[PDB]
Amino acid sequence: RFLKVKNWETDVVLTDTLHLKSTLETGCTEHICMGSIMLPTKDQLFPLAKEFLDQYYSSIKRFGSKAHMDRLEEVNKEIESTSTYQLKDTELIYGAKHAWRNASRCVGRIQWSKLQVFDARDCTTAHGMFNYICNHVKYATNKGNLRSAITIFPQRTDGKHDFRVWNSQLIRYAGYKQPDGSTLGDPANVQFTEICIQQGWKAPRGRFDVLPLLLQANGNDPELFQIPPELVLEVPIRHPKFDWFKDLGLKWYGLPAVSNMLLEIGGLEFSACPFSGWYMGTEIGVRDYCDNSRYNILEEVAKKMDLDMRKTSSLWKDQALVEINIAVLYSFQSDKVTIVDHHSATESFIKHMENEYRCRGGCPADWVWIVPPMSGSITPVFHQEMLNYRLTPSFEYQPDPWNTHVW
Amino acid sequence: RFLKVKNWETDVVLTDTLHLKSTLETGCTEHICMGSIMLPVRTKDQLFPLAKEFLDQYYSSIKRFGSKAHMDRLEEVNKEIESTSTYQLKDTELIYGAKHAWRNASRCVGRIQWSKLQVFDARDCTTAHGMFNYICNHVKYATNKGNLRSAITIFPQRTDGKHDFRVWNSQLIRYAGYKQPDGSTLGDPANVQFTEICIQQGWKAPRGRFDVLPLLLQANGNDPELFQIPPELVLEVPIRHPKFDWFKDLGLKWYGLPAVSNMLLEIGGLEFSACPFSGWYMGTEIGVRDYCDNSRYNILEEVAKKMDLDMRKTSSLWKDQALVEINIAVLYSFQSDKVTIVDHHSATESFIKHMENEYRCRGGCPADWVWIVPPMSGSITPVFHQEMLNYRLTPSFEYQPDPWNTHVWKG
Numbered sequence: 001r002f003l004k005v006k007n008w009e010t011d012v013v014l015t016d017t018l019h020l021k022s023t024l025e026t027g028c029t030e031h032i033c034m035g036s037i038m039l040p041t042k043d044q045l046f047p048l049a050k051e052f053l054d055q056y057y058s059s060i061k062r063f064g065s066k067a068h069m070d071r072l073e074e075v076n077k078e079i080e081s082t083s084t085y086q087l088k089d090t091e092l093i094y095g096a097k098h099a100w101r102n103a104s105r106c107v108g109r110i111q112w113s114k115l116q117v118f119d120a121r122d123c124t125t126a127h128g129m130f131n132y133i134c135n136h137v138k139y140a141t142n143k144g145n146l147r148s149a150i151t152i153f154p155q156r157t158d159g160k161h162d163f164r165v166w167n168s169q170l171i172r173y174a175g176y177k178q179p180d181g182s183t184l185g186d187p188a189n190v191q192f193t194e195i196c197i198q199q200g201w202k203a204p205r206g207r208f209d210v211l212p213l214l215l216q217a218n219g220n221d222p223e224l225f226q227i228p229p230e231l232v233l234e235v236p237i238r239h240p241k242f243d244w245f246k247d248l249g250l251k252w253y254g255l256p257a258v259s260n261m262l263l264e265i266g267g268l269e270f271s272a273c274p275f276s277g278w279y280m281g282t283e284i285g286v287r288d289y290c291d292n293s294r295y296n297i298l299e300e301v302a303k304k305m306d307l308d309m310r311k312t313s314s315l316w317k318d319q320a321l322v323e324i325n326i327a328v329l330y331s332f333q334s335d336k337v338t339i340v341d342h343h344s345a346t347e348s349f350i351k352h353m354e355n356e357y358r359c360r361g362g363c364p365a366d367w368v369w370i371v372p373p374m375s376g377s378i379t380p381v382f383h384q385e386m387l388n389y390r391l392t393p394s395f396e397y398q399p400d401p402w403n404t405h406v407w
Numbered sequence: 408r409f410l411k412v413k414n415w416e417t418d419v420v421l422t423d424t425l426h427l428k429s430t431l432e433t434g435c436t437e438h439i440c441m442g443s444i445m446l447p448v449r450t451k452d453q454l455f456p457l458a459k460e461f462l463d464q465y466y467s468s469i470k471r472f473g474s475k476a477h478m479d480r481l482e483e484v485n486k487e488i489e490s491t492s493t494y495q496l497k498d499t500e501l502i503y504g505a506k507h508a509w510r511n512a513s514r515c516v517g518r519i520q521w522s523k524l525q526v527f528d529a530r531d532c533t534t535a536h537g538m539f540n541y542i543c544n545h546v547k548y549a550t551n552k553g554n555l556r557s558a559i560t561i562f563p564q565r566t567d568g569k570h571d572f573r574v575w576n577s578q579l580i581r582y583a584g585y586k587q588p589d590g591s592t593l594g595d596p597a598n599v600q601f602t603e604i605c606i607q608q609g610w611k612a613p614r615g616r617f618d619v620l621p622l623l624l625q626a627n628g629n630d631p632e633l634f635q636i637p638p639e640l641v642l643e644v645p646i647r648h649p650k651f652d653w654f655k656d657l658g659l660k661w662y663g664l665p666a667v668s669n670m671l672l673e674i675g676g677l678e679f680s681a682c683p684f685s686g687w688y689m690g691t692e693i694g695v696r697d698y699c700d701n702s703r704y705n706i707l708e709e710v711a712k713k714m715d716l717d718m719r720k721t722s723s724l725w726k727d728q729a730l731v732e733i734n735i736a737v738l739y740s741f742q743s744d745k746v747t748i749v750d751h752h753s754a755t756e757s758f759i760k761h762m763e764n765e766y767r768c769r770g771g772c773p774a775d776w777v778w779i780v781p782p783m784s785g786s787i788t789p790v791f792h793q794e795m796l797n798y799r800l801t802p803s804f805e806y807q808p809d810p811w812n813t814h815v816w817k818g
C-alpha cells in the first residue's frame with residue numbers, strides 16, 4: 001500500500017503514498033500490464049466537486065475552515081439547482097496548474113507552477129476563439145523566449161454545445177497525398193488537411209504549409225481562420241558543421257501547443273483548452289523528422305553524409321540520427337528560440353521527482369513516455385523506477401471531433 | 408475476451424487471446440501500473456494442478472491430448488506427488504519446458520530463436536565439482552569457437568529448499584570489480600560485492616580491469632565452492648574501431664558468451680534453481696549498458712575526449728556522438744573476429760516478425776516494452792512503435808534473491 005521506487009544508477013529509493021489518492025483507472029490489471037498501449041449527471045458531479053474543493057482548500061491551508069464549508073455549501077446549492085457549477089478564477093488556475101502537475105507522461109513538469117492561465121470562459125463565437133488563440137500564440141511565443149500558457153474556453157454543458165479546436169496542435173504543417181503515390185508535407189495531417197480543403201481552405205500545396213484553425217464554438221459547425229503568418233515563429237534547420245544541411249530545406253515551428261485534449265477539473269470538462277510550452281529537441285529531430293511515417297528523412301541525410309548504408313550494423317541510421325538532432329538544437333539556439341535537450345530535460349525531471357516525493361509524497365510518471373526516443377539509457381530517467389497512476393485534475397485524450405460532430 | 412495491439416508506424420492491428428491462459432500476477436492493478444519496476448517450499452496441495460496444467464500443455468503441443476499416454480502420465484505424476492510429495496520430469500518434458508520458459512520470457516528480444524535451444528540435462532549432478540564439469544561443457548559447446556549456439560544446463564530441482572543447487576555468479580563469465588580505497592572502482596562496478604565474496608572464499612585476485620571471475624558453485628545446499636574456468640574456454644574480443652585507430656588504445660575487450668546463471672526455471676510447479684542459460688549478444692548490451700552506464704565502465708568521457716567533441720554543453724550531444732562510435736566499434740570487433748553478435752536494428756526487426764508469427768499461430772506474445780526497446784536509438788527501431796501486452800505464462804524464468812543473502816552456512 002506504501003510503495004518504493006528505486007533509482008538503479010544512484011540507489012536512491014523514494015516512498016510513494018500519493019498513489020492512494022488515485023481516482024481514475026490505468027488500463028492494467030493483476031493479469032495484464034497495458035503500460036505500452038497509447039490509449040487504454042447531478043449525482044456523479046457532487047462527489048467530484050467535493051474532492052476538488054477539498055484539495056484546493058487544503059492547498060491554501062484553509063481545510064475545514066468556514067470559507068471552505070461555505071464554498072462546498074455554495075457549489076452544492078448550484079449543482080442542485082443548475083446541474084453544473086462555475087469555478088472561481090482562483091480554482092480554475094489551481095485546476096489547470098494541477099492538471100499539468102498530474103500529467104504522468106510529461107517530462108517538463110518541473111515548470112508546472114509557472115503556467116499563465118487565460119480565462120476564455122466568456123468566449124461565445126469562433127471568431128472570439130480565433131482572437132483568444134492568436135493572443136495565446138503571441139504571449140507564449142514572446143519573440144523566442146517562450147512562456148508556458150493555457151487558454152480555457154467554456155466548459156461542456158449538455159454536450160451538444162461543445163467548444164473544440166479541431167486541430168491537434170495550434171501550429172502544424174499540412175499533409176497531401178500525391179498522384180505520385182507518395183506524401184507531400186507531414187503524413188500525420190493528411191486527414192485533417194483534407195477536411196480543411198473540404199470546408200474551403202485553399203491549400204498552397206507545399207511541404208511546410210502552416211494549417212488553418214478549424215474552430216467550434218458552442219456546438220456549432222467549425223469555421224476556418226488563418227493564424228496571422230507573423231505570429232507563427234519558424235526556425236530554418238542548419239548544422240554547425242555540415243554546410244549541405246541547410247540545402248535539405250528543413251524548418252520547424254518554435255511553439256508546441258496541444259489543442260485536442262480535455263481538461264477535467266472537479267468534475268467539470270473543458271473540451272477546448274489549447275496549451276503550450278517549449279520543445280525538447282528529440283521531439284522534432286527524432287520523432288517529427290525521422291519517424292518512418294513522419295518526414296522520414298534518415299535515408300536522405302545518411303546519403304549526404306556518405307555513410308555505409310549497405311548493412312544495418314554500420315549504425316548509419318544512428319549516426320544520421322545524432323546529426324539531425326545536433327542540427328535541430330543548434331538552429332533553435334542560434335535563433336534564440338527556447339529549446340531543451342533530452343539530457344537537460346531528464347535531469348530536470350529527476351530533480352522534480354525528488355521534489356514531488358519530498359513535498360507531495362509522490363509523482364505519477366509513465367516511463368514509456370518519459371524516457372527520450374534516442375539515447376535512452378544515457379539519460380537518468382532510464383534507470384529510475386516510476387509508478388504510473390491517474391490523479392485529477394487532469395488532461396485527457398478525446399475523440400477527434402469529425403467523428404462526433406453532426407453537421 | 409480479445410485484446411488488440413496496434414503498431415503506430417504500420418497500423419497493423421493484432422488480437423491477443425493467449426493472455427487468457429495467464430496465471431501468475433503482474434504487479435499492476437486498475438489503480439497503479441508497475442510496468443517500469445525492475446523486480447515486482449510448495450505443498451502437494453498446490454503442486455498437482457500445476458503439474459496437470461503443464462502436462463496438458465505438453466500433450467497438446469504433441470497432438471496427444473486426452474490420449475491413453477496423456478492419461479497414464481497424469482496418473483503416474485499424481486501418484487508420485489502423493490507418495491513422494493514431488494515428481495520427476497521425463498526428458499522430453501524438461502526439453503519442452505525449458506524452450507517454453509524462453510518462448511514465454513516477455514523481456515526477451517531474441518525469442519525468434521526459442522525453438523533452437525540445446526538442453527543439457529544435468530539432473531544426475533550431485534556435487535560442486537560435478538557442476539563445474541557440466542558448466543565447462545556448456546561453455547565450450549555454446550562458444551563453438553565464435554559460432555555461438557543457444558544452450559541451457561539444468562541442475563537438480565529444489566526439494567525442501569534446504570538442498571538447493573545454485574550458481575552464485577549472476578552470469579557464468581563476468582569481470583571482477585575492486586572498490587579502491589580512494590573510492591574509485593577498478594574493473595566492473597557491477598560485480599564488486601560478488602568479487603569480494605570470491606576473494607573471501609579464497610580467490611587470488613589478479614586485480615586488473617578485466618579479470619574473469621571464478622565460478623562459485625553450491626550443490627545440494629552445501630557451502631559453495633570456487634573453480635576457475637579454463638582460460639582457453641573463455642572467448643574474448645578486443646575492441647577496436649573501423650575508422651578510429653586510437654580506439655584500441657583504450658584497452659577495452661569483452662567476452663563473447665552472455666550466459667545468465669542466477670535465474671529460476673519453473674516447469675509444472677517444479678523449481679530449477681540452477682539452470683544457466685546462454686545465447687549471443689545484441690551489441691547495445693555491451694556498447695550502451697556495460698560500457699556507458701555511469702555505474703559500469705563509464706567510458707563516455709574518455710571516448711568523447713579522444714574524439715575532441717565539444718564537451719562544455721550537453722546540447723552538443725557529445726554523449727550521443729560518442730555512444731554511437733562505441734557501439735559501431737563493438738559490432739565491428741565481434742564481426743571481424745567471427746563471433747556471433749546482432750545489432751539492435753536487426754534484432755528488433757526479427758522480433759517484430761516473431762511477435763506477429765506468434766499472434767497468428769499462438770494467439771499472442773507477452774512482451775515487456777520497457778525491456779524490449781533498446782537503450783539507444785529507441786524510436787528508429789520498429790519495437791518503439793509497437794504496442795505490447797505484458798502477461799506471465801508458465802513455464803517461466805523468475806528472479807531469485809542472491810544466495811549469499813539466504814544461505815545457511817555449514818562452515
Ligand code: HEM
Nearest residue numbers: 100103105106107108111148149275276277278279280395
Ligand atoms: C514547458 C515545456 C514543456 C516541456 C519541455 C514538455 C515536455 C513534454 C514532452 C517531451 C512530452 C511528450 C510529448 C510527445 O512525445 O508527444 C510531453 C507530454 C505532455 N505534456 Fe508536456 N512539456 C512542457 C509543457 C507542458 C505544458 C505547458 C502542459 C500543459 C499545461 C503539458 C502537458 C503535457 C501532457 C498532457 C502530455 C502528454 C499528452 C499526451 O498524452 O499526448 N506539458 N511533455
Ligand code: HEM
Nearest residue numbers: 509512514515516517520557558684685686687688689804
Ligand atoms: C539467442 C540470442 C539472444 C538474444 C540476442 C537475447 C536478447 C536479450 C536481451 C538483449 C535481453 C535483455 C538484456 C538485458 O538488458 O538485461 C534479453 C532478456 C532475456 N532473455 Fe534473451 N536473448 C537471447 C537468448 C536467450 C536465451 C537462450 C534465453 C533462455 C533460454 C533467454 C532468456 C531471456 C530472459 C529470461 C531475459 C530476461 C532477464 C531478466 O529479467 O533479467 N534469452 N534477451
Ligand SMILES: Cc1cc(N)nc(CCc2cccc([C@@H](CN)Cc3cc(C)cc(N)n3)n2)c1
Nearest residue numbers: 038108256257258275276277278279280283397
Ligand atoms: C494517439 C495520440 C495519443 C496521445 N495521448 N497523444 C498523441 C500526441 C499528441 C501530443 C500531445 C501532447 C504533447 C505532444 C508533443 C509532440 N511532440 C508536443 C508538445 C506539447 C507541449 C505542450 C510541450 C512540448 N514540449 N511538446 N503531442 C497521440
Ligand SMILES: Cc1cc(N)nc(CCc2cccc([C@@H](CN)Cc3cc(C)cc(N)n3)n2)c1
Nearest residue numbers: 445517665666667684685686687688689692806
Ligand atoms: C537487477 C536485475 C534484475 C533482473 N531481472 N535482471 C538483471 C540482469 C540479468 C540478466 C538476465 C537476462 C539477460 C541479461 C543480459 C544482460 N545484458 C545478458 C544476456 C543473456 C542472454 C542469455 C543473451 C543475451 N543476449 N544477453 N541479464 C538485473
Ligand SMILES: C[C@H](O)[C@H](O)[C@H]1CNc2nc(N)[nH]c(=O)c2N1
Nearest residue numbers: 036037038368369791792793794
Ligand atoms: C506503442 C508506444 O507506446 C508508443 O510508440 C509510444 C512509446 N513512447 C512514447 N513516448 C513519447 N514521449 N511520445 C510518444 O509518442 C511515444 N509513443
Ligand SMILES: C[C@H](O)[C@H](O)[C@H]1CNc2nc(N)[nH]c(=O)c2N1
Nearest residue numbers: 382383384385443444445777778
Ligand atoms: C527502472 C527501469 O525499469 C530499469 O532501468 C530498466 C529499464 N529498461 C531495461 N531494459 C533492458 N533490456 N535491460 C534493463 O536492464 C533495463 N533496465
Ligand SMILES: [Zn+2]
Nearest residue numbers: 028033435440
Ligand atoms: Zn501496468
